[PDB]
């Protein structure tokens, strides 16, 4: 089965500015560290749409020392940030205003790019560098406290990456990105992009997974192909609105759930790529049909609930993906 | 038999920290008041047969140091500084940091807050419970060039883990180069601890019944064997220079030789321990035991331990192994 799949991954590697990204990113951080409010800003981890090699994605982190999170209305993912506080200008009463902080952030960046690069209208900010390279800059608060209680039952990697690794990972900070909920516009959602990267690049039960020939697995390739399938289908139907609400994050979440379900490295041997990918697709399909895709870190938050994505969009994606899988994925070509 | 080793391990498990933690926390609270030891803190410990004897390390970060290796001894160094903003200005003997002066002030502050004895490179306090405090400089720079070929865990714990570990800081404890009196010796106690408590090729090593290994038990038994033989022959001087660190280093080498968890199945404790002993014996006979982090530093050289001492320990261990280890009774 895997012949066309391996061809796809070969072209995908072939395709992959970063320097041009690093220049302006470090310049922006240089100026942002001059402000009293963004003094502790810094790069969180360049990152990527697998099919868009010129679309970059960076995250600026800013530690907020001693914070009081207040969960917003039983939504397990959205919070208010309550608290010499260098964010004094951004408070609106007792909660921190994402709108004000973001407006400042964008203003500093807009003034700093006009010295060199266009900033698009409201990912907090999107810069377009010379009609070819684009960079989405996201601002996130960093908290070095223990994780919120809604993550208590998430990150169930104990049988895969081990309970020891889970404890070490949960000792790391967590992040908060502004996102309006429903739309309450001063709420923040949790971010674990650092943990996701760690999980994906250190992904085997064996510490030497993918480091020698006897232990080559196909986890990363399965995730690559899943993201590519979704990106290609989103392009093919961009003029309708069906696939608009689907993102690489849904596919990455489903992939992590599959990793939990298949924790042994031998279930991911490279020679079985064909079936492994099939299984991955199938699991994603199941998540679509049952309208259930729990956040990997907050299991009570369903990314596929009918309040976030309607049934018609899910059924459309299901029909498209089933056609592709029945026809040796013509969309890849 | 193997059941004898299991009996030893069970008796060991039957075996204060609450007190040690209280005391040590008080000492650190008061030491951070002093200007020179403002950045002092705990790093992360036991003599397996002496559960009431504790070993604590007090780390102190030194932001931007220059290391000058002492006379091609790849483990001992002079600590100099880079370009009165150095809070250790009180301790320079010219341009090199003086271990003697720093240790004098260390013992002096400890001896100004305790007023439990302070027996006179550690500082020994009692509480019928004893605690040895070792002061260590912390450097967050990359590791010295002598460690480049050490920590050969690539086929065991992975090259990824080796890179991650080498990104962590390293430590320097005062120790005479036997002598010249102001040299510092490399220390990687943190890394040793981490690779001992996270020791399998599988991340889930020892977290389920299917993956119970016997690495930790093998190290425990070797340490116990050395301690019991040192007590047995304390009247002679032959075993004075052997320590649990030699045992731990040989054990780490064995883990490098045997990287697969299936080579450490708990069911084979008896053979695993045997092989451990055997490797240690080989190290004794050939007088070669490389530091696990600095391969060119030979812990078993004749300039450090004489051949007669090694031969005596060799014969005593061979006796024990040939007689089902009576020193474990
Ligand atoms: N409507 C939604 C969908 C999902 C979440 C969401 C929730 C949590 Cl708890 C985490 Cl950790 C999340 N990470 C990401 C998302 C997310 C969604 N997302 C983006 O919005 C990117 O712009 C990707 C990255 C919240 N609201
Ligand atoms: N004569 C000796 C013996 C060995 C080393 C030695 C050398 C290095 Cl590079 C490291 Cl990392 C070391 N760690 C330890 C030692 C050691 C020796 N040691 C003690 O001195 C305990 O007080 C145990 C802990 C240097 N000189
Ligand atoms: Zn792998
Ligand atoms: Zn184990």
Would you kindly provide a written description of the structure presented here, covering whatever features stand out?
- Chain B: The modification N6-acetyllysine is found at residues 193, 201, 203, 223.
- Chain B: The modification (Microbial infection) Deamidated glutamine is found at residues 260, 263.
- Chain B: The record marks 132-133 as: Cleavage.
- Chain B: Residues 13-44, 193-216 are annotated as: DNA-binding.
- The structure is a homodimer.
- Helix content of chain A is 38%, strand content 16%.
- With 333 residues, chain A is of the alpha+beta class.
- Chain A has two domains: 2-14 and 147-173 and 192-332, Orthogonal Bundle (Poly(a)-polymerase, middle domain); 15-146 and 174-191, Beta Polymerase, domain 2, CATH 3.30.460.
- In chain A, strands 1, 2, 3, 4, 7, 8, 9, 10 and 11 form a nine-stranded mixed beta sheet that branches. Chain A has a two-stranded antiparallel ribbon with strand order 5-6.
- In chain A, strand 3 (68-71) and strand 4 form a beta hairpin.
- Chain A is globular and about 60 Å long.
- Chain A binds chain B through residues 158-159, 161-165, 202, 204-208, 211, and chain B through 155, 157-161, 198, 200-204, 207.
- One zinc ion is lined by residues 199-200, 205-206, 213, 215 of chain B.
- One ligand JUJ is lined by residues 75, 185-188, 245, 291, 293-294, 297, 299, 304 of chain B.
């Amino acid at each position: 089965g895997a012949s066309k799949l391996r061809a796809v991954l070969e072209k995908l590697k072939l395709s992959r500015a970063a320097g041009m990204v690093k220049g302006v990113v470090d310049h922006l951080l240089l100026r942002l560290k001059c402000d009293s409010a963004f003094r502790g800003v810094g790069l969180l981890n360049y990152e990527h749409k697998i099919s868009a090699p010129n679309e970059f994605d960076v995250m600026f982190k800013l530690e907020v020392p001693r914070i009081q999170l207040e969960e917003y209305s039983n939504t397990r993912a959205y919070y208010f940030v309550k608290f010499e506080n260098p964010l004094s200008q951004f408070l609106e009463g007792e909660i921190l205003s994402a709108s004000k902080m973001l407006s400042k952030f964008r203003k500093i960046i807009k003034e700093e790019i006009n010295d060199i690069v266009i900033m698009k209208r409201k990912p907090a900010v999107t810069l377009l560098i010379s009609e070819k390279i684009s960079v989405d800059i996201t601002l996130a608060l960093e908290s070095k406290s223990s994780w919120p209680a809604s993550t208590q039952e998430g990150l169930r990697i104990q049988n895969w990456l081990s309970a020891k690794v889970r404890k070490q990972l949960r000792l790391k900070p967590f992040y908060l990105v502004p996102k309006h909920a429903k739309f309450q516009e001063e709420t923040w959602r949790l971010s674990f992009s650092h943990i996701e990267k760690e999980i994906l690049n250190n992904h085997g039960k064996s510490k030497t997974c993918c480091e020698n020939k006897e232990e080559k697995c196909c986890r990363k390739d399965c995730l690559k192909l899943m993201k590519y399938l979704l990106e290609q289908l989103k392009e093919r139907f961009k003029d309708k609105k069906h696939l608009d609400k689907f993102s690489s994050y849904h596919v990455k979440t489903a992939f992590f759930h599959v990793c939990t379900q298949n924790p042994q490295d031998s279930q991911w041997d490279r020679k079985d790529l064909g079936l492994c990918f099939d299984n991955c697709v199938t699991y994603f399909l199941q998540c679509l049909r049952t309208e259930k895709l729990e956040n990997y870190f907050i299991p009570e938050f369903n990314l596929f609930s009918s309040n976030l994505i309607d049934k018609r969009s899910k059924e459309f994606l299901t029909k498209q993906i089933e056609y592709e899988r029945n026809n040796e994925f013509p969309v890849f070509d």
